[PDB]
Amino acid sequence: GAMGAKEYCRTLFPYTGTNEDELTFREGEIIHLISKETGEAGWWKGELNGKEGVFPDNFAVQIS
Incomplete structure (x- = not known):
């Protein structure tokens, strides 16, 4: 569904990754x-x- 055409996002809030696969x-x-x-809707x-x-997309806003 999505097509990574070189998309970029900015974080609106900080987030601490608890997992290693989780971005701090x-x-x-x-x-x-x-x-x-x-694979999941939201991450x-x-x-x-x-x-x-x-990371949950709720912490960021997309730039491109």
């Missing part, structure tokens, strides 16, 4: 969106800081 981010971070479809996969993991 601050607010104001431009994340490189990898996949919106992680996006993004790469930030060299880490590509999943």
